[PDB]
Design a protein around this ligand. Structure first.
Ligand SMILES: CC(=O)N[C@H]1[C@H](O[C@H]2[C@@H](O)[C@@H](CO)O[C@@H](O[C@H]3[C@H](O)[C@@H](O)[C@H](O)O[C@@H]3CO)[C@@H]2O)O[C@H](CO)[C@@H](O)[C@@H]1O[C@@H]1O[C@H](CO)[C@H](O)[C@H](O)[C@H]1O
Ligand SMILES: [Zn+2]
Length: 397
């Protein structure tokens, strides 16, 4: 018998198949590989800090959820165990792009779990009532946003507490910020996409035509339940969280579509989260941990219940009934799978955490008019370069 520990930050909310109930099915069938999964008791950004303290203390879990944007960071801090041959055994159970994001320098450190493509959530019934359509161009988007804002309804958000992924994702839909050239990281967060995103959100904020409530504040939930928020860009895994936040408002009326051609992106979209599960330094059971993890990550209907757009290609889960009930009977998982397939490549630098922390601060100022949306991307540039220099890494800008 071997005992495995798995630390995760899956929501485990009402209506979901709880992680402990998924693990229970494994534990009944595999007496020699016994798993205990624990939900991290803290906000998402504190989890890799806990993994670092745990690995230093010599008491880390075997397995831990690591965002794709976090892999380079935990790799650089020496937190990962090479499981290349174990991962190769399970490669055909997963999509190639997310599997590649669990790799550094031809070595694999775990299995991918989900992807986080950005899409557009909107009240389709309300759009039809108000005489509007999903805007096809940035200029149409701004004109339509001003028209709804005149009657106290909003078709866009600017979420200062989600600046890291909302600004990097909408900008990143049209090209990378970070590249590797020989020995160095090459940093440019002021791309054509960054300029386009700043221009669009600057016009929306100048015209009081996007809601600036932080995503994780009660004001965001109140905006949905009160009927004020009738459209927003959103990460695909927000679907169940958004439904719960709505408190029944819009049930049977909403739909999902692709991110529009608003930021010079055409039919492409960006990445907002999405994670794998890494094998940590000091794990005494990588082979058994990876056997369990391949099984876990291919429990497609249970993982979709948690809001995951799964990396697994072993089976296809139907849109959960809870989601299609909310979203007008729409097959929203088909829209999420299309969005995933249109997600532009976007390599993350080690220390992207620190870049997000600084971007959040500037975005609060852009939201209240004390800074420009473009300053968020300048903050990203300077904090990107300073973070790389502080990690002792070679950086060019
Ligand atoms: C990319 C990611 O992990 N997204 C999480 C999301 O994490 C953000 C939130 O916790 C907000 C709360 O304000 O904080 C952000 O971190 C800020 C931090 O607050 C600042 O103190 C610091 O200064 O800057 C950091 C940046 O380092 C977090 O980025 O939280 C949501 C809600 O809990 C998570 O759902 C989301 O992760 C995704 O969860 C899905 C399951 O619901 C999937 O597992 C998916 O793969 C995850 O990406
Ligand atoms: Zn500089």
């Amino acid at each position: 018998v071997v005992n495995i520990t798995y630390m995760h930050r899956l929501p485990d909310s009402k209506g979901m198949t709880l992680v402990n109930d998924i693990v229970a099915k494994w534990n009944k069938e595999h007496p020699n590989i016994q798993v205990k999964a624990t939900k991290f008791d803290g906000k998402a950004s504190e989890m890799i800090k806990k993994l670092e303290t745990d690995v230093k203390a010599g008491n880390a879990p075997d397995l831990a959820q690591v965002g794709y944007a976090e892999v380079p960071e935990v790799f650089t801090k020496g937190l990962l165990q090479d499981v290349t041959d174990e991962a190769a055994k399970y490669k055909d159970d997963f999509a190639s792009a997310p599997f590649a994001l669990m790799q550094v320098d031809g070595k694999t450190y775990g299995l991918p779990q989900d992807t986080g493509p950005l899409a557009y959530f909107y009240n389709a019934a309300e759009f039809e009532k108000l005489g509007i359509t999903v805007p096809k161009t940035a200029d149409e988007l701004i004109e339509t946003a001003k028209k709804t804002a005149a009657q106290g309804k909003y078709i866009m958000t600017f979420q200062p507490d989600e600046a890291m992924m909302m600004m990097s994702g909408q900008a990143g839909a049209s090209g990378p910020w970070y590249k590797v050239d020989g020995n160095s990281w090459v940093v440019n967060t002021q791309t054509k996409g960054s300029k386009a995103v700043a221009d669009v959100y600057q016009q929306l904020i100048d015209n009081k035509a996007a809601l600036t409530n932080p995503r994780w504040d009660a004001s965001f939930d109140n905006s949905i339940q009160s009927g004020q928020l009738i459209g927003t860009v959103a990460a695909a895994w927000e679907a169940p969280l958004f439904i719960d936040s709505a408190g029944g408002t819009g049930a049977g009326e909403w739909k999902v579509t692709q991110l529009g051609d608003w930021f010079g992106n055409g039919t492409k979209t960006g990445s907002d989260g999405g994670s794998g599960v890494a094998v940590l330094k000091g794990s005494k059971h990588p082979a058994e941990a990876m056997e369990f993890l391949d099984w876990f990550n291919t429990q497609v209907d249970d993982l979709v219940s948690q809001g995951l757009v799964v990396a697994a290609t072993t089976a296809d889960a139907k849109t959960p009934q809870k989601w299609s009930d909310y979203f007008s009977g729409q097959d929203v998982m088909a829209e999420f799978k299309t969005a995933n397939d249109n997600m532009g490549d976007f390599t993350y630098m080690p220390g992207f955490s620190a870049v997000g922390a600084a971007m959040k601060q500037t975005a609060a100022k852009a939201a209240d008019g004390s800074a420009k949306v473009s300053d968020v991307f300048d903050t990203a540039q300077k904090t990107s370069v300073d973070t790389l220099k502080n990690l002792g890494l070679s950086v060019k800008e």
